[PDB]
């Protein structure tokens, strides 16, 4: 039906998108990137990011597809010397969608609230001095948190920033979320969990400041500093990432793939 | 209904199982261990372990009930000043059962095969010499793990064992297991993913033997020599254990008690 | 002899500030914030790394003695109730002076040089983009290094922010520094070391950008944008800094009560 | 001068060994393998390691060197088609000698002592219940131990067991050991410092046991049981290893080549 394809902008990609959509005047395929219902993004994770938010209004009418020009990128399902493949199936259509959970983050204000989506992970750090904010899971006081910050990612994002700083890699059939801590201090007078926190569909996990009120939260390649914050608010969103899928590639072959050998 | 009591077997948990048999005897309530509905564990976690395992053939007939006459065990819910309370509530019945998923263990040998359940976790280790094995998820080869061991979680498991190999703590609410490496080999020949793995309900993780074919498999507490392996198979059990409730008591905050403050 | 005294600046801080000038009074000891000869500084490890840096051009004159007003300062000796005690034995002086290692950071430009001293430690971490470094050691290339930012810690610094990204503690008679990681990624492409590194006196590790030149360096609590950067060099200092000492507090009962109990 | 070889034990090592004495026997060398003056070993580091504990009596008069026969063994300098130069520059002398550090192991009994040498670490397990012991630095009381066991590295053996352990890899100048924890337990109630030890020389850190006194000691590979122990005392040692070196090796490319790439 309709589609649109977005380009990392290299030349490599440019010429990719080009090439498909001459494959695609072939088929009863309509370019539209107003109200597509395929979004093809070619190039890397970044990429795939970026075409996720320019449509997260309408997550629930696309299905998505990623083509890596450079390495492996997660996100993506095919090499560009598949692209005339990809085109021919996906014009007659008949394909599985998988569906990937999402983060909702709830930003509150005091004397106004704004909510963002993440397909990998929402951070929080603060704007220069130290970071300490309470944790609140469910509204019982779990820690006080001090340290560099903390790190809320989906199931796919668990292979992203999250595994960096020592999270579980979760598989994406499991609606959760997981919170890892960014360098906290421990000793006789300050105390946190340590661990990472894996939180179910329907828990909240609530960060309050305890002195300063500026944070520099980030939610996927987006970074914003937030001044003037009452509350950050974290919970598996009710809305799913939608892929189009042409062939088994199960999400642990990819972990293998990306992290093992290929 | 019938119910039984475990005790620890020092003198202050002997004395709290005599009381509370002696205040059950007021009511409608039979002591029965062959055919118990209510089992009250009146000790530590290992005491808790120890009539969990006692009883893994009856698990859809029995709630469980722990008292910690030690420090706050992590399966209680009671301190030995509230048993009156505890006989009078059970006595009257009407709680809330809750239920927490189990991991199902599968060992296979050469010219057989064994099952075991564990409420906390399964691991293997080698019978002295390398652990070597071959980590196969829903039939595809994985890893080569090279170190000492590997752990498999319960979610309620994950503030054991699993939590002191870097494992993420997991609401037990959510049907699944995660897999905690100990101390693995990582140089230009030998690669493990490293980060533990969260695996769904219907996901099977399987060990390989490489060389070495002789291994020492924990289950709980308890601990045996398996010589000629083929395989060791994981997956989240059907079966769960239930637990009788009478009072708020959640998860997260259990987890603050135990680790935070109390 | 000639001596000062920093103060945290609050009610409890200054008033023993004064409290000690006074007794000083009745000793031979003149006040010289310009030429001391004994710096105490009395507040939190904050505190005492200011009185640091407020005299790092004649750390070969100077001991340093630390009061804690708050909890156990790591620097600090004394609890406030042996101000008089510490006044009666530093006027009579006949002290020890130990020595801890200092590390030397160098930061060059292009169409320039900077050098500054660190008690605790030196990070490196990107003005926002992603940061990318390549981390040669005594000229020979030892890594890309791709993630966060990295840190460079002194023996005493090692309980700092060193230890909250898992380096290891280091007794201050090892004359070292200790390079740790921040949230490094890894994975097919990418590749770090992973493990906290210890280099002696008289090895140089140089940072080297690969992309984006600009830079936020981090000096203990002193944190400066430096822009234009060619290079990062770090190496243990031949300057030290001087404690005056007037019992016996081990280093490793120090880490004992900071983190064990106390 | 005196030389012995040792080889792995596989035709490829067997043979070189052969071709290397018929290579000797071309110059004033004499094959001697009960007072060598060189020992090279032809094989892994397994191999290398059986050869220094071989001689570890003699260790002043030797100096070793290291054919790896599969991968870059880490205690190896030379690949098997060098080994007609090392025949050559060995038999003209005239070489470098460095010098690594090593660890020293007491073990005292009820109703006696063994000592014990580690080129790479000596570790603590217990005989299959739980590993309790407190540690004792330098006669001061640090922690109880609660977990699955420790480890005591030499500098040249932190990129061994100790890396696996979350241990920093220290330059083997440095005159040092460092302990490692192996899957400590930590709660409300137990508590140990989490992050590794680095001890400089004539530290002495001595384990104690609290309940089980029987235990498993591994010194490189060899691993004992060890029964009615009262002590368990680690330092650096007097004695030292020496290598014969031809060339400029350095060890932080040592490191490169092992772990990163080559
Ligand atoms: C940064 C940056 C600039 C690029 C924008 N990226 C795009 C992506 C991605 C992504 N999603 C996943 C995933 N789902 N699974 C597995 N892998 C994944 N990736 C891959 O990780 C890398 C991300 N970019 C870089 O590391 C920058 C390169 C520095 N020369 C790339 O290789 C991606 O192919 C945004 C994402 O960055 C992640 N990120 C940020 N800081 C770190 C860090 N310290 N360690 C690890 N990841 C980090 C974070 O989660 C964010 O969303
Ligand atoms: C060992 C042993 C002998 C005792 C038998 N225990 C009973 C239990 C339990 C348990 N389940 C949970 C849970 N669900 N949540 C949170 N906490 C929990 N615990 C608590 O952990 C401790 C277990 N025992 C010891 O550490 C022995 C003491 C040494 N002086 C106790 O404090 C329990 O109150 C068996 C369990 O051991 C765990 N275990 C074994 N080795 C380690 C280790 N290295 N680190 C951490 N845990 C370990 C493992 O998972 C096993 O099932
Ligand atoms: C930050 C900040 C503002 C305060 C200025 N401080 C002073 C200090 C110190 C210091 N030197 C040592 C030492 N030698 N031994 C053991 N302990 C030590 N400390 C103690 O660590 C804390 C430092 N400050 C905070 O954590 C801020 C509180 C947040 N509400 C205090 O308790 C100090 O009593 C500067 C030092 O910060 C360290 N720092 C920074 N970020 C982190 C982090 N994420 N984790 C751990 N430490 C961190 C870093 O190395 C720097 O030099
Ligand atoms: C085990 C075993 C059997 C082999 C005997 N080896 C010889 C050696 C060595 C050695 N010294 C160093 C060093 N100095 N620098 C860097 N690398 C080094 N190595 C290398 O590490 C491996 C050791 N063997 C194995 O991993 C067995 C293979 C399993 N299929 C090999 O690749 C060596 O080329 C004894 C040494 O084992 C180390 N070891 C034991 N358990 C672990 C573990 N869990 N993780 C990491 N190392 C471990 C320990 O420190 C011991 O001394």
């Given at each position: 039906m309709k589609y649109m394809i977005t380009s990392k902008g290299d030349e490599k990609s440019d010429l990719l998108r080009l090439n498909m959509i001459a494959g695609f005047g072939e088929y009863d395929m309509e370019y539209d990137?107003?109200?597509?219902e395929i979004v093809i993004s070619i190039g890397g994770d970044g990429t795939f990011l970026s075409a996720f938010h320019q449509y997260e209004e309408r997550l629930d009418e696309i299905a998505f597809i990623g083509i890596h020009?450079?390495?492996?990128?997660?996100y993506a399902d095919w090499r560009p010397a598949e692209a005339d493949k990809l085109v021919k199936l996906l014009a007659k259509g008949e394909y599985q969608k998988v569906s990937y959970p999402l983060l909702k983050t709830t930003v509150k204000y005091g004397i106004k609230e704004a909510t963002y989506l993440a397909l990998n992970e929402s951070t929080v750090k603060s704007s220069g001095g130290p970071f300490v904010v309470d944790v609140v899971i469910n509204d019982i006081h779990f820690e006080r948190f001090r340290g560099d910050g903390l790190c809320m990612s989906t199931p796919s994002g668990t292979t992203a920033y999250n595994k960096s700083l020592g999270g579980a890699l979760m598989h994406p059939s499991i609606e959760a979320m997981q919170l890892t801590e960014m360098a906290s201090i421990n000793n006789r007078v300050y105390r946190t969990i340590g661990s990472p926190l894996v939180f179910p569909k329907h828990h909240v996990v609530s960060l309050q400041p305890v002195?300063?009120?500026?944070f520099q939260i980030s939610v996927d390649h987006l970074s914003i500093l937030h001044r003037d914050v009452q509350e950050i608010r974290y919970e598996v969103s009710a809305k799913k990432i939608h892929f189009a899928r042409f062939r088994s590639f199960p999400f642990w072959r990819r972990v293998h793939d990306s992290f093992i050998e290929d």
């Amino acid at each position: 039906m309709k589609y649109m394809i977005t380009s990392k902008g290299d030349e490599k990609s440019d010429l990719l998108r080009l090439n498909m959509i001459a494959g695609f005047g072939e088929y009863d395929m309509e370019y539209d990137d107003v109200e597509p219902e395929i979004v093809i993004s070619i190039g890397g994770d970044g990429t795939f990011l970026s075409a996720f938010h320019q449509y997260e209004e309408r997550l629930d009418e696309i299905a998505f597809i990623g083509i890596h020009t450079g390495h492996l990128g997660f996100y993506a399902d095919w090499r560009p010397a598949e692209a005339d493949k990809l085109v021919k199936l996906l014009a007659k259509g008949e394909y599985q969608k998988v569906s990937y959970p999402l983060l909702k983050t709830t930003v509150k204000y005091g004397i106004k609230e704004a909510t963002y989506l993440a397909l990998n992970e929402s951070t929080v750090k603060s704007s220069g001095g130290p970071f300490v904010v309470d944790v609140v899971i469910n509204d019982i006081h779990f820690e006080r948190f001090r340290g560099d910050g903390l790190c809320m990612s989906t199931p796919s994002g668990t292979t992203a920033y999250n595994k960096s700083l020592g999270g579980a890699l979760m598989h994406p059939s499991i609606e959760a979320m997981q919170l890892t801590e960014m360098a906290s201090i421990n000793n006789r007078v300050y105390r946190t969990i340590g661990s990472p926190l894996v939180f179910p569909k329907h828990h909240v996990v609530s960060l309050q400041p305890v002195n300063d009120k500026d944070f520099q939260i980030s939610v996927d390649h987006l970074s914003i500093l937030h001044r003037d914050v009452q509350e950050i608010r974290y919970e598996v969103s009710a809305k799913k990432i939608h892929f189009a899928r042409f062939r088994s590639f199960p999400f642990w072959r990819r972990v293998h793939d990306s992290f093992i050998e290929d």
